[PDB]
Design a binder for this molecule. Structure first.
Ligand SMILES: Nc1ncnc2c1ncn2[C@@H]1O[C@H](COP(=O)(O)OP(=O)(O)OP(=O)(O)O)[C@@H](O)[C@H]1O
Ligand SMILES: Nc1ncnc2c1ncn2[C@@H]1O[C@H](COP(=O)(O)OP(=O)(O)OP(=O)(O)O)[C@@H](O)[C@H]1O
Ligand SMILES: Nc1ncnc2c1ncn2[C@@H]1O[C@H](COP(=O)(O)OP(=O)(O)OP(=O)(O)O)[C@@H](O)[C@H]1O
Ligand SMILES: Nc1ncnc2c1ncn2[C@@H]1O[C@H](COP(=O)(O)OP(=O)(O)OP(=O)(O)O)[C@@H](O)[C@H]1O
Ligand SMILES: [Mg+2]
Ligand SMILES: [Mg+2]
Ligand SMILES: [Mg+2]
Ligand SMILES: [Mg+2]
Lengths: 752, 449, 172
């Protein structure tokens, strides 16, 4: 019901835009049954609606090729109406068109160059001679002939704007030629269709700025005054200023733009004078819309503001929107990154009554955004925008635009050999072959990350699941953890349960916790934020808690996101055991983490993963299911896992075939993964020492070791040691057996 | 302005936003602002000899006004335009709905009773939102692209009780707009066990507003403080969610450490502001999840730290003592570490009620398992009673984890079947006995003895 | 012809001495576009509204001479996080920069470049796409890179025949 405004409902007037085979710039062709339904005779002047407040006039024609549900037009009228292929436009009979007395015509500057003959005589005179072609202001049409075809833009027509060009009517092309960039920018205008995702938000905005203007009679009849204030808030890059541009481009209302800091002035009372001048200019202009970009810049809380000028400006805004004298139907929109920074008196019904959340788009929303951004791009056949939409988990639309731009720039980079920057021009063949393919989009996807996570970007050493030896069950569980809620949510909605979103890795040092986190960061299809434990702590009072809150908010925005704490035992610990820690800053941080993982806020697809050497000291509430639901124990590998670890370390290593890894794994009882990696590194280093001494011998005689042999591994094992002791294993197994006793029974079976 | 008022007397001078030009001259930094405050004080003093000039001013920050203006002789009288009660809200709705095309089925008394913290601008917003919902309902008949409309649409267009109920669902007090947080939809049947706790909470939240005359008769004021303490995962925050969703009262859900700020004196200001907006929204439930973050034992931070936490807890106790019996603000606290709460928080008149949320028992565990599985397709031959008997010391979170892991295994099996059919070409409608057994094989007790 | 706009915002970052201001100087010297230099601090003024007025004047001047490049040296000085900065005249200059870089009216041919030793202290809304499209890490050079730097610096010097810059590069 919210998007009821948006639906077209398939009215008869709308017809699909189609290519016209023979119709010239001033005529259109429609099917005979469709005209019979519309009661239109041949040659009738018919008015065409267009997007962005554009309209076109043409002469209807009876075409058998044209379908009843379609209208055939050339590119000229399509340009005039600002529409693309497959769009639906209105047609209505145009009443009382009067023959023109005089029209002022201006050509496009890029066309006028290279034409020695007079443009009016060569082009306009034969084109318009006995033409009987209706024209409208702002309509760009093309005339063939001469060396180069010269487009003509009719700036002025009389009677304004509907007239029929006739031989008696005076036509002239004298004046400054229209800048090609001006017409291009007119084409490059934002509309409600250029807004992707946020369909309900756009529906609300259209109900609140477009609906009262189109049909005031609704609100005069039902006897209510529509909302007069819009606050757009969301993370940066979600489309707040884009929605403002769309509204400005395609509303008949007067639009006044206020940029936040532009109000400020050094003179006393000059800022308030600027605000009053803006509001008075809007009020003079009947229905008007005032957009205040960056509202939080000039609307801070009066109680928290220190400077008097800022508070006086906030008060001026307060009295302007809702004071003793009421606004004369002036719509006030504003956009802000920080809605909670705004003065609370502004956020009531009289001033900013409706707050619209332009949030992070979902998969379908971001597919729509990708289609909008690539509608003008040249895409190859293998491009698949649905897959790109699936991959980009945290992107907000500015990130999608960045992805498309980087894909196109990669497509251009593929042509560097054929293109020389010293060369003044590029070949036609290079222009034709240049296009964006799926490979470029995949590369851009590899480069792309959400902008909100730029601050939390950490280089991960590119570990793969195969780099980890053993831990097959843990690998499967981590992959399922990250994948099932993302790719298969309807399964959870069918079974009616939310996914678990927490895992704790506890085990001896060197056994593969951080390695599993690296494998997740590289292989899992989710955003990844990596946190060293004590990095969130700050000297200031309340700032460590703010850092925890901020990192959790970043994870929430970028969902599905994996939040990894490499050393959980630092930031999370049992409360009440720290004598100092500031003023209980450590305990307050723990409580903040507790409220973040499980509080009264709704749950998102944020997976918190923690690794700890010593799991006994972590706060018991942190371990509670719903916060780190699963406690995974990463123990010392057994012989099969030791074989797998040794093989995973030596896969790239050129190692002798006669080297026996099974014997090594058998002898290395009690060794961790770091221990076996150390054995392999020692063997590599002994081989390198041997090769260096052989090369030194060759150099001396002038004035070897392709692979790692059994003797190298023998000596490496001779210097090998066991890193984790039996007491450490005893305490880890003690924690594991406490959990096992918590299970309460050896085997659970339902009675038969 | 004052001279023009005197020339045309009797006169009334209305100073809208008085705090814009009347800050405390001591706190004022600018010379022109100070000179203006002094000039306005001088004009107010000279207002005595003025024959018929009366100055009326309005401000929403009365405290920020310079105190010298609030002595006697200048701005002598102060009128408190407060938050309207139920009958006041009904009067405001009658005023704002007199031009509306109200249907017959509407009862503005119900709309007045539902809106608790609304101040009158929120009631106008409710009327506007309801009328816009009414227009939305007819948007199928009339498309926006239509330049003109049928008259039968005008005849059809009117505001019904469904529209007011929709606006009621959408409506939130403007005061609580900065504090609003999305809360999961939880009902009292979503909670299993704690029947006595549910009844006691409903009594504490309902009786002081519905029957204050009873408390006046017996002379005993209702308690305005609750403390939830218990093992983690046992349902304190679940009860808070249920109260937020079901109870007919405003809810302010605030974590502990978000009030704290590095700037000196901002944390106490935040505490004052949250309690003030709790008063403005009464009947309001003020909930502190993890109470021990802001309310911790005094003397611990005395030795180590700046000392702002003690100031915070002092301001909290001041705010709790400030609110009177008549104002209906219920302060609920929850902590899984009761021992590290400051006992001053616990003393009578402040969080007096102490409710312990224990580890659930066998009947409670059956109730918890049934509540978790009410919306899940489960095999008839699954026995929740045996699950409750086998899970002796499990908390509610542990049982929910059992159910979630059973769901995960069922989803894994369904995906396996999908992959099998896809591979062979080129199932699991409900959770069963074996899924629950395999989930139990991983089960653990969150809370130790 | 490909159907996209080129990226228009560049944030160079790295430790001191890597060559961010050197790269800015090279770009200014060897591009055929109106180059505007903004120093971070110099915009600031004690007056209210003067500093963002300076930013508006600079961006408008770059607009009037298009195509243009604006270089904002020491961006962290002029662009701290709004959530962190307390003073109003800092929040306001950051908001002005945000509006100038991507607002309801978008700069057409202006390329805004910046250099910061610390990129995290920059306000996150600036690190967005539409403002600062791509961030380039000018990092510590390798042995070959530092050999190239030594060759660049010693091209003007007179070096004896025994001079071997390869060893000097290997040692530093
Ligand atoms: N929903 C969307 N659909 C299509 N394009 C979008 C959408 N959201 C953003 N964009 C594009 O990405 C960029 C985002 O800039 P925009 O001005 O819309 O963001 P914003 O919400 O105002 O952000 P900021 O808080 O930084 O001001 C623009 O280039 C815009 O074209
Ligand atoms: N299962 C494994 N397969 C392959 N390599 C492993 C494995 N376990 C550990 N390693 C090796 O151990 C080293 C890093 O160990 P890792 O970071 O995983 O330890 P950790 O368990 O997180 O320990 P810590 O508590 O000390 O941080 C790497 O050399 C890695 O190759
Ligand atoms: N009585 C109950 N009925 C149904 N589910 C319950 C019950 N008690 C707990 N749960 C489940 O366990 C979790 C409840 O955790 P909750 O946040 O309520 O605990 P808490 O007592 O506030 O703990 P903490 O102090 O550790 O945050 C939810 O997943 C909920 O589904
Ligand atoms: N890559 C380089 N190649 C050649 N010379 C270099 C290079 N990097 C730095 N230099 C030399 O070092 C000098 C100082 O470097 P520069 O001023 O560019 O540093 P910066 O990274 O901008 O530092 P700052 O943080 O002080 O702004 C340059 O003028 C130049 O002489
Ligand atoms: Mg913006
Ligand atoms: Mg580690
Ligand atoms: Mg809780
Ligand atoms: Mg420099």
């Amino acid at each position: 019901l919210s998007t009821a405004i948006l639906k077209q409902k398939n009215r008869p007037n709308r017809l699909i835009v189609d290519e016209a085979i023979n119709e010239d710039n001033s005529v259109v062709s429609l099917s005979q049954p469709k005209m019979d339904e519309l009661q239109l005779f041949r040659g009738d002047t018919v008015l065409l609606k267009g997007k962005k407040r554009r309209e076109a006039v043409c002469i209807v024609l009876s075409d058998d090729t044209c379908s009843d549900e379609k209208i055939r037009m050339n590119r000229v009228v399509r340009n005039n109406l600002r529409v693309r292929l497959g769009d639906v436009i209105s047609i209505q009979p145009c009443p009382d068109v009067k023959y023109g007395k005089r029209i002022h015509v201006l050509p496009i500057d890029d066309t006028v160059e290279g034409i020695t003959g007079n443009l009016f005589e060569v082009y306009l005179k034969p084109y318009f001679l006995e033409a009987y072609r209706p024209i409208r202001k702002g309509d760009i049409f093309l005339v063939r002939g001469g060396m180069r075809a010269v487009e003509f833009k009719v700036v002025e027509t009389d009677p304004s704007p509907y007239c029929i060009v006739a031989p008696d009517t005076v036509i002239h092309c004298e004046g400054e030629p229209i800048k090609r960039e001006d017409e291009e920018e007119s084409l490059n205008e934002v509309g409600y269709d250029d807004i992707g995702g946020c369909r309900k938000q756009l529906a609300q905005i259209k109900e609140m700025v477009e609906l009262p203007l189109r049909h005031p009679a609704l609100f005069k009849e039902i006897g209510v005054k529509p909302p007069r204030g819009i606050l757009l808030y969301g993370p940066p890059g979600t489309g707040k200023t884009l929605i403002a541009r769309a509204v400005a481009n395609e509303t008949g209302a007067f639009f006044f733009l206020i940029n936040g800091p532009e109000i400020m002035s050094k003179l006393a009372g000059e800022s308030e004078s600027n605000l009053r001048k803006a509001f008075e200019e809007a009020e003079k202009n009947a229905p008007a819309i005032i957009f205040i970009d960056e509202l939080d810049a000039i609307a801070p809380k009066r109680e928290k503001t220190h400077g008097e000028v800022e508070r006086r400006i906030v008060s001026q805004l307060l009295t302007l929107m809702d004071g003793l004298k009421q606004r004369a139907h002036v719509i006030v929109m504003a956009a802000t990154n920080r809605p909670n920074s705004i003065d609370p008196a502004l956020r009531r019904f009289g001033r900013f009554d409706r707050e619209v959340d332009i949030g992070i788009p979902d998969a379908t929303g971001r597919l729509e955004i990708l289609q909008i951004h690539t509608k003008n791009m040249k895409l190859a056949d293998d491009v698949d925008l649905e897959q790109v939409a699936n991959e980009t988990h945290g992107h907000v639309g500015a990130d999608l635009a960045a992805l498309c731009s980087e894909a196109a720039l990669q497509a251009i980079r593929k042509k560097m050999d054929l293109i020389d920057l010293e060369d003044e021009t590029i070949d036609a063949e290079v222009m034709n072959s240049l296009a964006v393919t799926m490979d470029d989009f995949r590369w851009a996807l590899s480069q792309s990350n959400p902008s909100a996570l730029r601050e939390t970007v950490v280089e991960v050493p590119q570990v793969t699941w195969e780099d980890i030896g053993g831990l097959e069950d843990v690998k499967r569980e981590l992959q399922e953890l990250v994948q099932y809620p993302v790719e298969h949510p309807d399964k959870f909605l069918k079974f009616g349960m939310t996914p678990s979103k927490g895992v704790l890795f506890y085990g001896p040092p060197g056994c593969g916790k951080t390695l599993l986190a690296k494998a997740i960061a590289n292989e899992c299809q989710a955003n990844f934020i990596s946190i060293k434990g004590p990095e969130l702590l700050t000297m200031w009072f309340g700032e460590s808690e703010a850092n925890v809150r901020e990192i959790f908010d970043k994870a929430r925005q970028a969902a599905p996101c994996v939040l990894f704490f490499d050393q959980l035992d630092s930031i999370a610990k049992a409360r009440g055991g720290n004598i100092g820690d500031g003023g209980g800053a450590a305990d307050r941080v723990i409580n903040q983490i507790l409220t973040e993982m499980d509080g009264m806020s709704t749950k998102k697809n944020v997976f918190i993963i923690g690794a700890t050497n010593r799991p006994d000291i972590i706060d018991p509430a942190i371990l509670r299911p719903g916060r780190l639901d699963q406690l995974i124990y990463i123990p010392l590998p057994d012989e099969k896992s030791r074989v797998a670890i040794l093989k995973a370390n030596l896969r790239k290593s050129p190692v002798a075939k006669d080297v026996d890894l099974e014997f090594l794994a058998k002898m290395t009882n009690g060794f961790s993964g770091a221990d076996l990696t150390e054995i392999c590194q020692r063997a590599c280093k002994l081989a390198i020492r041997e090769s260096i001494e052989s090369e030194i011998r060759r150099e001396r005689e002038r004035q070897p070791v392709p692979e790692i042999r059994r003797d190298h591994f023998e000596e490496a094992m001779r210097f090998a040691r066991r890193s984790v002791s039996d007491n450490d294993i005893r305490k880890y197994e003690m924690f594991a057996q406490t959990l096992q006793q918590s299970r309460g029974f050896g085997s659970f079976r339902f009675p038969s």
